[PDB]
Each structure stands twice: as structure tokens, then as C-alpha cells.
Design a protein around this ligand. Structure first.
Ligand SMILES: Nc1ncnc2c1ncn2[C@@H]1O[C@H](COP(=O)(O)O)[C@@H](O)[C@H]1O
Ligand SMILES: Nc1ncnc2c1ncn2[C@@H]1O[C@H](COP(=O)(O)O)[C@@H](O)[C@H]1O
Ligand SMILES: Nc1ncnc2c1ncn2[C@@H]1O[C@H](COP(=O)(O)O)[C@@H](O)[C@H]1O
Ligand SMILES: Nc1ncnc2c1ncn2[C@@H]1O[C@H](COP(=O)(O)O)[C@@H](O)[C@H]1O
Ligand SMILES: O=P(O)(O)OC[C@H]1O[C@](O)(CO)[C@@H](O)[C@@H]1O
Ligand SMILES: O=P(O)(O)OC[C@H]1O[C@](O)(CO)[C@@H](O)[C@@H]1O
Ligand SMILES: O=P(O)(O)OC[C@H]1O[C@](O)(CO)[C@@H](O)[C@@H]1O
Ligand SMILES: O=P(O)(O)OC[C@H]1O[C@](O)(CO)[C@@H](O)[C@@H]1O
Ligand SMILES: [Zn+2]
Ligand SMILES: [Zn+2]
Ligand SMILES: [Zn+2]
Ligand SMILES: [Zn+2]
Lengths: 327, 327, 327, 327
């Protein structure tokens, strides 16, 4: 029995007896993700190189993927009439939606994750976290400052060899594969669970000289297992969306701890850490900063940064033990 | 003036006064690559999941992506009437084209590189190397056992966020972006040259306990710069075609030396090492095993393996200097 | 403000306070129409001609568009869990859906209209009429034997230079253009109304020798206007979906009266005449058999045929006057 | 063995021992046609309707489909470095290619045929005819004023339910189906031949009061067969490229004789009449004005018009016999 994202969301909406506003918001997301996917795959690039004549700004004067993606997400989410506040990785201030388009939801998103991998064509993506506004006050940024544990839905779209949307809600994590031939997301994995233990560690070891003792010790074990067991294999794509997705399906651990240049970690709490921590906990995994649960941090800034360790429970647990081992 | 790959190959053929056979071969390669990417992006997957019933098929043909890609290369190249010997990473023996479809070119190809990243949707691709048959004798595997220096043309197609085919021939390297909307590869970078020195090192550090001393000394040097400069960033996609392409565009160094499981390295010489080595040297870069030039190795086995270090000249020679410092 | 079919239908569902079942059925229709559109445009035809090898039944042994379209519609509508009875132009008996998939709606459809235009690649399409089952009896064919005037929704998808879906419901007719680049239907025409009078007559004059006096007289006027005004132009695509769509947007009249071979007309009441008569009346046009309203006929057979005259009100009215003129 | 249009043109070039210029011209024509169809199918229309905002553009460039198609043909042909004189149904004067991009071929083309069917989404297309410059003089419109019999190659691309390019050259006619999924035209019918006699007549009968006696006598003969056989079916799409293509595949007769508004017929000789006439004769069919062969007319005006009757030999000669019976 074929099941598309469209049918799945609509039905989950019926089972929860929703009024239909969130379902409309998710349908908008779906559409946004497809438009970004098409532009990311370079559809119609021939026009920029003068196939129809008029080869004007054939350099850098037209929308760069980062910006185009941010416009699609904002414009589409707005037009869903289900949001009131929006937080983008590409915007300094929270985006307060006009009253005539205002909804009860707050969305925190990363329109195009994997910044440094854009020019080399490595996998990139979009990340999103949705909150139900809780307060009778007028829309402001504080409405997006809720701890991740208050997330109603979170997930991401991966633009890789193929495009896949991973959606996580109260009752589980579901994976949908995009069939570009018909512009439809097909459910291929129902209520997914990450393996208890993996054999892959993911981190940028270029910061070796800045790692804290716990991280430094953990890495030593993956390369030189004290029990002489087989060493973990290493993998680091460079785009958080890509590295987290492999972690979800293959197992293992992903890491981005603090360092000199980034004392509180590089990844942002609102639209990078929380959505992935939610997807991970719902899949049966763990997401810690090393001292606490990511979903428990009470955000104080819109672009606040936080250190994160996520993946299989046994692999993450072992690293927490190291942290405690170091007082 | 916009330049399509079809326009480019044909003109390069005219400038070389060829009979048109090599032109027909490249055109067929262009067609094969488009087909493989369309399949990689999962076009038509809804059918596998029963969108039109469950009797459309008369057998159980769930062809795995790697097999399907290999089937496409084989049939498409053969229908070009320009080849006589084919070596695939997928077949134990060389494939000898039937007399009627026989041409004078030898093609060594890697159907879909990045096998471990197929299920997690990370970038994968196809790598190729073309040689002229140099023997009046009847075509056999021997004609495929030539040193990389004899290549007339080599390259690859990358199926990442977007699909790009990179082709290198005697007169230089050129990158073409596939425009999925019209099924056309567009020339977007001419006579490409790699940076003399980069700031990214690429290797699977999970084999740390099995690396030779030269590799170990170099890694520490990237993490702890003796001149005290900023340490190189680390990147390891897990797919050679992917990691090699970023090395070309961003500069830096890619490494896959020998280890316990692979005493002579893991990567294959004919359709992995050689093609990428030729692309690199043509871009003014380097590619060595650590003791000699990859393109100079005369193979004795079509599936022979070899250790490889490629990338920016200054980066590679620095490592080559560590090797020759020990021994 | 961008509006997609997905958002439009969902919203109309909210305004009517529906439970969500019909909305799910319409979403299924939308998906069906896209899959048919892709197969109609010949996506992936390269495989049938041996691009990946195995050129077996390269003649006539695989699904012909007529059949493939009928499978997609049936399978998709079934999987929507909103139907109980289905009437297809390609099936002799009414299709009674399994209890575990049963809904309250009855759908009458023409999966691929324009049979004779398939091989010459002329415009073809899909037509549909939806009824809300009215009776506590068990699902049977009689449930689809309701007069067109009981239609809850009707319309068609036109596979022409571009693909467009025309949807008609109680509050109007709306036209949606398909953007194949993202697999999304975009609303381009809101609540459309046909012009009071056109300048185009559409009919197969090859049956001249069989036309009744009224038709014969009417045609004389279009070619030789008694008042010496400019003559109407003639247009006959051959596919009902194509001819009716032009009629809706340009105005004029479309005709398929009785003849020798077809004493009661060739076009079928259930899935050709009623849906178009409904779309036409909702757009402000007329649909008569010459003696009565199409939407008023009480069907007695599932594949019953009926004569039809449709289009601008003034053009249709004038022909009715001729009929009365002839007692 | 699967045959792509790219493979076919190149090989036909090799067999003819050409320098490769005409091969490069045809390849460019292949590229242009793909681009036009992708635009015709409305790829990317969501952008026009603001899916990404309302500031993406820096001007008002709502290029109409016919203008865009003309822009593509002009720029793409010129970037082929194989032409010197271009005549478009869209430009009052011939376009003389700049000396640097000058080649020896003359191309007469119809950017998008079927203008009256553009808004109603009925089939439309592009028609072309190629000639060799036959004059050492400087290129001018005169080089485009040659009799149809001098064509080296002619054909058209049909954008109907699917896109098909038909190409006719000295050795016969061949049809290629565009596979939108890989952007490749597939050879699906070789050395095509029209039926000696069909059963469909195609003409706009809205000009009945302006037809000459021969045309009138023939129409009555199709409606009232003197031998009392079954009357021919009528078909008139309104787009020449469409009606002509069905005539080729199904056989029969197509007609557009002279009338009051068009004393010398409406259709243009250089890029409408001639190309279709050449395709027809090569398929063993006929094409006359009623008094002479279309391919024999020596034009004096690039936008000159001419009456035309084409199709199955027996059908056309029957009409040619009515003409020569009167006068
Ligand atoms: N499509 C849906 N999928 C899952 N939960 C939903 C859906 N629609 C509504 N809900 C739940 O019902 C709540 C209220 O929905 P709404 O009335 O649309 O704002 C949401 O916050 C969700 O917890
Ligand atoms: N399209 C082309 N691009 C570059 N070099 C070519 C091309 N076609 C032919 N050549 C060169 O000319 C030689 C002979 O070509 P051929 O007669 O086609 O086998 C090839 O081995 C190449 O060195
Ligand atoms: N999406 C919709 N668009 C228009 N009318 C609708 C929609 N959904 C429900 N309705 C109306 O409400 C009735 C009951 O809907 P349902 O409860 O889904 O069976 C339908 O028969 C329609 O008349
Ligand atoms: N691709 C081709 N298909 C058919 N005939 C061709 C082709 N290329 C060249 N010819 C023939 O050879 C002549 C000279 O070709 P060229 O040297 O390219 O101008 C043309 O005018 C055609 O008659
Ligand atoms: O080069 P670094 O420090 O590993 O940064 C990579 C990280 O940057 C990001 O692009 C965020 O800026 C993440 O997607 C990725 O995990
Ligand atoms: O898991 P490892 O040892 O890092 O191997 C990865 C390598 O394997 C390959 O898939 C070839 O087997 C390459 O594409 C990639 O570089
Ligand atoms: O050849 P005829 O008698 O005009 O039949 C054409 C009619 O047949 C149909 O294909 C239905 O069978 C209609 O779509 C079209 O109006
Ligand atoms: O409206 P009419 O007189 O039938 O003309 C239709 C003809 O006009 C054209 O659009 C050319 O002007 C042709 O494609 C078509 O055959
Ligand atoms: Zn990010
Ligand atoms: Zn490989
Ligand atoms: Zn029909
Ligand atoms: Zn025209």
C-alpha cells in the first residue's frame, strides 16, 4: 500500500483531531523542500550561461543557493498562514509574520546546511524545528526561545545522491524518499530506531590541539581499542545534515565539541542542535553536550551556540562516562 | 557563447582530425552518465513501492543501484561501436566486445564509486579511463594493462547535491554541470588548475595504528603546525570520487595509504587510482604511492591495487619529503 | 500569494468542515494525475529500447498507456481509503472496493481520454466525476447510477503542450497549471467563467451524411452566416478533453450528436458527458443532448452513451432553438 | 542496439565524410528543441507566481513563450559556428550572423508553430529547413531564397502528449522520442513511409464559402463517398506541425488552400510549407499547391506564402485530378 508524505501527514492530522493548521504548515514545508531540491540539483543552470541570450550577470549578482533557499522557505511558510514567528540561520532578527498571515506556530530552520560543502557539491540540506507558540503575548523572538523538549515536530531534508526527508514527531521518526519523476515523497522507513551501538566516529580532528581531555581520550579508544577489538572507521562529510543522517541509519556517533575559536561549540542550538537531538531521541538515540541533554537547554539567544554529541546510546553513554571520569 | 559537453567533445575531435570514433565513444559515455544519475536520484521509485499495483512485472528484478549502473555502462559503451576491451570493478574478468561492435578503445571504469555511502545517500559516482589498443593481436585483458601515462582521456561524474562530469585530456581539465531540466552538461570551468597549497587533509584515521611512520608524522603536522600556523581542517566523505573532487576544487591533500587489511592499499589502479591521478597531474597537481608516480606503474593484474596520495603539489611533496627522509 | 492544489483543496475542506476523507481522495487524484502525466510524456522510454540491456518484449507485451493509466488511478484511489465503488472506461463491471479500504465516495473516471490520438501524440487526458454514496445498501453499481446533478466534484487533467488540472465544485471552476520541475499544481485561474458567445464550432463533419436536420442547419449558419457576418472558425482535436478545454477558455461550442453507427451518441454519460457538463454549467456554460440537460439524465447503464452539445450559452441556446424549430 | 539522435547524426556525418560542421549544427538544433519543450511544459512556472518572493528579478521580463523559443533558436544556432543566414517567422528581416560565428549553412525556422493553440494548451512545435549557402558572395537573404528541392535536411519537433523530433535527409525520414528523464531523443521508427491511402481529411471548414471548386468537390466526396464506402473522419488540431505529424503516422490528407483573407494561402513557404513538403516526399508522400510542387517553387520573398495539400499519394493525386479536371 503506497504511502506519500502528503497522505501520511494529513492522516496523522486526522488521528490527532487537529484543526488542520499544522497539516497545512507541513504541506508547505514539503513543497519548500522540493523547490530547494530542484534548485540545488541545478535545474535550469543553462539560462545563467546564456542559452537564451542575454548573458548579463554571469558571475555573482543573482541568487546564491543560500539566499534562494532562505527566500523559498520564508515565502512558502508565510503563505501557509500557520506561523507567527520564524528563525532563520540566514537572518539576524526573528521574523515576525504580518497579522493577516499569522498562525500559532514558531519555526526555527536552517535553509541550507553544509555551507562549506556548497561549492564542492558535497551533500547539503535543510533542517527545521517546529514549536506551538505558548503565551498570549504579541509575537516576538522569545516565542522561539523554548527548550527543544517542547518540539512538536523536527527533521531535515538531505540533498545527497538522492533527496530524503526525515520527519520526527511524538510517535516516531519516519523517512521519505523523493521521487523527482513525480514530485512526491514516498515513505520507505516507518518508525525508525538507531542501532544500540555503531562502528563509526564522526568529528573534525583538525582541532586536535584544542580538544578537551574527554574527547581526546575517547578518540584514542576508537583508534586504539584498549581491549584490542577492531577499531571504528572514521567518516566526516562536513555538513551536519549529511553526517547525522548516516549516523541515524548506520549507527555510531557524531561530534562537535568546544574548541579555541568556538568555546561553546560551533553548531547553533535553535536550528541545528535541537532538531537533530529530537530526531535522535525519538529514534532511540542520545544527544548530549557532554554535561547535559541538548533538549533541556533553555535558550537565551536566537543564534546561541552549543556543543553536541549524538548517536547510538552505547557510544554516547561511553563518552559521558569519560566526562564523569574527569570529574 | 554557451558550451555543451556535446559541442566541446565534437570540436575537440575536429581539432584533432579524428575519424570520429573517439567522439562517438565520449558521446556514449555522456549518455550513460545521465542515465546513471537519473537512477541515483531515485527517479521512478514510486513504482517499486506499488503506485500502479503489483503485477506490472513478470519477474523479480530488483536490480541494485551498482548492478544497474554497471549494466548501463556496458550496454551503452558497446552500442558505441568504439571499444574492444572493457574492465569493470564489477566483473572478475575483462569483457571482450563481440567482433561486430568492436572498436579500438580500451575502457577501464568504476560503475558506481562509494559503495559504503549508497544506503546513507552520501555522494557516489562513476570513474573512467580511456586507452587506445596498442597491439595488432586479438583484444584481451593485456590491452587494458597499460601505465596510466598512456591515457588519452580520463575523468568522472559526481552525483552529489548536483551532478558534475569532469573530463581531462591532453590539453587540460574541464568541468561540466549537468542541467537536469534539459539533460545537458554545461561547461562552467575551463582549463582548471588546482591550488599549489591547500588547507584540508583527507584520510580515514580509523587505521591510525596501521599507518606507516611517514603518514603518522604528516598527520601530526596537520594537527600541530610546527610553524604554529592554523591546523588543516579534516574532511573524509568515504567516497573517493567525492573526496577527490573537493581536493581539485578546494585544493589540499587526499590519502589512502597501505594498511593491515590492505598491504598494498585498497583502491584499484586501473579505474580508481589512474583516472584520478591523470586528472590531478593535468590540473598541475600530484599523485604518488609514496615511493613513485601512480601513472608510471605498469599493472600486471586488472584488479591490482595501489596506495595513493594526490592533491596540491606543495602539500604532496611535503609528504613525499617525509617518506624520503625516513628511508 | 502562491497557491498550490494541495493547499487549495485542504483549505476548501476546512471551510466546509469536512472530516478529511474527501480531501484525502482529492490528494490521491492529484498524485494519480502526476504519475499519468509523467508516463504520458514518455519518461524512461530509453529502458524499453535496451539502454540497460535486456531488450526483451521491445514490441507489444508491456503496459500500454491506456492500461498503465487505469492501474494508477485504481491503485491510488483505492489506497486513499475514501472510495467504495469505482467506474472505469476500461472496465466492464463496476469495481467494488474491499471493506478494509472502503470509503463513502463513488468515482466515475476516464483514465486516458483521446484513444485515437495516442499514437499520433496529440493531446490526451483523464476525466473524473465524484459522487457521495447515498444509500445504506451494500456497495454495488447502482451507487454510480446517479444523475450528474448529484456531483460533488468533477474535472479533468489535460496532457497537452503542458499539463493542466481543471477542478469544479459547488463554488466554481478552478484551473491549475502543473510545474513538472517540482511536481506541483499551481493555481493560475480562479473561479473561471466561459464567454457568453464564441466563434469556434467543434465537431467531426465526417459524419455529415448522418447528421439530423438541426445539426445540419446549425453548421450551415457557422459557415454561411445568414446575416452575412464573419464565419466561425473550425477546430476538432479528436480528444474530448482537448476540445472541451479550448471551449472553456476560448469560448464557442463542442458537439457530438447521434449518427448511424452511434444512434445514442458515442460519448459515455458517466465518465465523459456528466463531468464536462458539470464543469461547463459551473463555468456558466450549457450542456444539452439537444432535448434535455445532460446533468438531468437518469443513467440506467454503467457504460450508457448519450449525445452532447456544450459550450457558450448563446451558441448552445441557438442550437436548441433549431431543435425546437424542428418540432 | 539503442540509438540516440546524437549517435545517429554523428554516424550519418561520418558516412558522408563531412568536415563536422553540419553535425555540430544538428547537435545544436537538438539542444535548442529540448530547451524549448522544457519551457513549453511550463517547467519552473511556480517562480512566475512568486514561490520565492517578489524581488528576485531586476526588471519586467515576462517573455512570452513564442519570443523565448525564438531567442533560444537564434542564440543556440549561432553558438554552433555553422550558420551565416537565419530566417525566422518572428523577424521581418533575415538575420546575418557576425563574421566570427559564421558558417556555411542557411536555416529557415518556425520558432513555435501553432500560435492560436498556445493559450488553450493544444500541441505546438518548431519546424526547420537547412540549406547550404550557394554563393561566394557575402551572405544575405538571397541565400535563403532557394527552392525546397535544395534542402539538405528538414524536420520538426512536436510538443504534444510527448515530445518527438522528426528529421528527414536524403536517405529517408526518422522519428525520435524525447525521453525527458535523461534528456535524450531515442530512435523509435526508422526509414518511415506514409500509407499510400488514408481515411482522414484535415482542413478548417470555416472557410467553406471561400474555397475553390476543386476543394469543395473533394470535401463532399469525403463526406459522401460515390462508391458508397465509409466516409473519411475529420481532424483539425489548428497547429500545422500537429496535423501534419498525424498525416505522416496515420496517413490521409492535410489541406490549407487559398481564401479571401489569404489569396495565396496562409502558411509560409520557407519555414512551414517547404520543410513539411520535404518530409512528406521523403516518406513517399506528396505536397502540392494544387497546380504545382511545393518544393519546386522559387521564392522571391522570405515571408512568402503558398497554398498547400500534402499526405498520402493516392489521396493527394485524387485531389490533383479534380483540379486538372476543371481547368
Ligand atoms: N498533521 C498532523 N500530524 C501530527 N500531529 C498533528 C497534525 N495536525 C495536528 N496535530 C497535532 O494537533 C495539534 C493541534 O493542531 P492544529 O489544530 O492544526 O494547530 C498540533 O500541535 C499537533 O500536536
Ligand atoms: N573528441 C575528441 N577529443 C579529443 N581528442 C580526440 C577526439 N577525437 C579524437 N581525438 C584524438 O584523435 C585520436 C584518433 O581519434 P579516432 O580516429 O576517433 O580514433 C584519439 O585517440 C585522440 O587522441
Ligand atoms: N476538500 C474539500 N473541498 C471541498 N468540499 C469538501 C472538502 N472536504 C469535504 N468537503 C465537503 O464536505 C463533504 C463531507 O466531506 P467528508 O467528511 O470528507 O466526507 C463533502 O462531500 C464535500 O461536500
Ligand atoms: N550529420 C550529417 N548527416 C547527414 N549528412 C551530413 C552530415 N554531416 C554532413 N553531411 C553531408 O555532408 C555535407 C558536408 O558536411 P560539412 O562538411 O559538415 O558541411 C553536408 O552538406 C551533408 O550533405
Ligand atoms: O569545518 P567544521 O568546523 O567541521 O564545520 C562543519 C560544520 O559547519 C556547518 O556547516 C555549520 O556551519 C555544519 O553543517 C558542519 O557540521
Ligand atoms: O572504508 P574505507 O576503508 O575508508 O574505504 C573507503 C573507500 O572505499 C571505496 O568505496 C572503494 O572501495 C572508495 O570510494 C572510498 O574511498
Ligand atoms: O473519431 P470520432 O468519432 O470523432 O471520436 C472522437 C471521440 O472519441 C473519444 O476518444 C471517445 O472514445 C473522445 O475523446 C473523442 O471526442
Ligand atoms: O485559424 P486557421 O486559419 O485554421 O490557421 C491555423 C494555422 O495557423 C498556423 O498557426 C500558422 O499561422 C498553423 O500552425 C495552423 O495550421
Ligand atoms: Zn547549518
Ligand atoms: Zn570505486
Ligand atoms: Zn474518453
Ligand atoms: Zn507556424
Amino acid at each position: 500500500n503506497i504511502v506519500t508524505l502528503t497522505r501520511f501527514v494529513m492522516e496523522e492530522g486526522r488521528k490527532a483531531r487537529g484543526t488542520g493548521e499544522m497539516t497545512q504548515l507541513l504541506n508547505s514545508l514539503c513543497t519548500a523542500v522540493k523547490a530547494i531540491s530542484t534548485a540545488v540539483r541545478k535545474a535550469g543552470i543553462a539560462h545563467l550561461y546564456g542559452i537564451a541570450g542575454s548573458t548579463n550577470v554571469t558571475g555573482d549578482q543573482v541568487k546564491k543557493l543560500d539566499v534562494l533557499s532562505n527566500d523559498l522557505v520564508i515565502n512558502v511558510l508565510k503563505s501557509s498562514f500557520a506561523t507567527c514567528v520564524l528563525v532563520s540561520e540566514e537572518d539576524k532578527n526573528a521574523i515576525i509574520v504580518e497579522p493577516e498571515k499569522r498562525g500559532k506556530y514558531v519555526v526555527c530552520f536552517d535553509p541550507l546546511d553544509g555551507s562549506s560543502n556548497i561549492d564542492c557539491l558535497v551533500s547539503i540540506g535543510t533542517i527545521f524545528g517546529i514549536y506551538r507558540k505558548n503565551s498570549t503575548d504579541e509575537p516576538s523572538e522569545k516565542d522561539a526561545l523554548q527548550p527543544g523538549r517542547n518540539l512538536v515536530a523536527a527533521g531535515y531534508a538531505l540533498y545527497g545522491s538522492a533527496t530524503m526527508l526525515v520527519l520526527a514527531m511524538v510517535n516516531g521518526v519516519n523517512c521519505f524518499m523523493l521521487d523527482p519523476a513525480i514530485g512526491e515523497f514516498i515513505l520507505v522507513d516507518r518508525d525508525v530506531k538507531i542501532k544500540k551501538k555503531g562502528s563509526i566516529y564522526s568529528i573534525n580532528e583538525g582541532y586536535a590541539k584544542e580538544f578537551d581531555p574527554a574527547i581526546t581520550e575517547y578518540i584514542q579508544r576508537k583508534k586504539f581499542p584498549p581491549d584490542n577489538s577492531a577499531p571504528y572507521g572514521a567518516r566526516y562529510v562536513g555538513s551536519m545534515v549529511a553526517d547525522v543522517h548516516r549516523t541515524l541509519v548506520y549507527g555510531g556517533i557524531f561530534m562537535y565539541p568546544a574548541n579555541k575559536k568556538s568555546p561553546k561549540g560551533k553548531l547553533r542550538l535553535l536550528y541545528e542542535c535541537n532538531p537533530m537531538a529530537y530526531v535522535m531521541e525519538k529514534a532511540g538515540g542520545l544527544a548530549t553536550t557532554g554535561k547535559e541533554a541538548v533538549l533541556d537547554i533553555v535558550p537565551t539567544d536566537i543564534h546561541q551556540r552549543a556543543p553536541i554529541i549524538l548517536g547510538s546510546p552505547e557510544d554516547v553513554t561511553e563518552l559521558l562516562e569519560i566526562y564523569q571520569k574527569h570529574a
